[PDB]
């Protein structure tokens, strides 16, 4: 019942996504940055993250890695998987993500998982070792959704990511452009 309510709600997203993300123009696109870098957000201000960064990597991969606790890799009772699958398939940009990946540092360990539209592609696996904790999730849009564009404005991310470093004092966030190999460009952001 977990699990089919969890396909349900692919679905829905899917078939509805403008009610969830607000439109599926280039307004859209960006807004999933912001639903990732939110989740980040709230873990520095819990009081276990001060790092942040955003890459646009090739082919408008979004990469955001912080360094907070990792999300967690426990078994639920609710689910019987194991929790950052539970967090992962009830994301929004999971669901209009046509893949997705997560790599959590946590407990000394590595653990990786991989998605489309929503959906796992595998169980939850050890893939090496650590002595960091934080989350990477790297997305790729997808242009079934986002029929108008799925390329990135660097300045459009740079505004508000500026903005964010402003308004957070103390965490630290970086852009970066990787789509071009010959010129990358990164602004970091670190207020007080």
Known sequence: AGQIQVLEGLEAVRKRPGMYIGSTSERGLHHLVWEIVDNSIDEALAGYANQIEVVIEKDNWIKVTDNGRGIPVDIQEKMGRPAVEVILTSSVVNALSQDLEVYVHRNETIYHQAYKKGVPQFDLKEVGTTDKTGTVIRFKADGEIFTETTVYN??????????????????????????????????SYHYE
């Open 154 to 187: 660097y300045e459009t991310l740079q505004q508000r990511i500026r903005e964010l470093a402003f308004l957070n004092k103390g965490i630290q966030i970086t852009l970066r452009d990787e789509r071009d190999e010959e010129n990358v460009r990164e602004d």
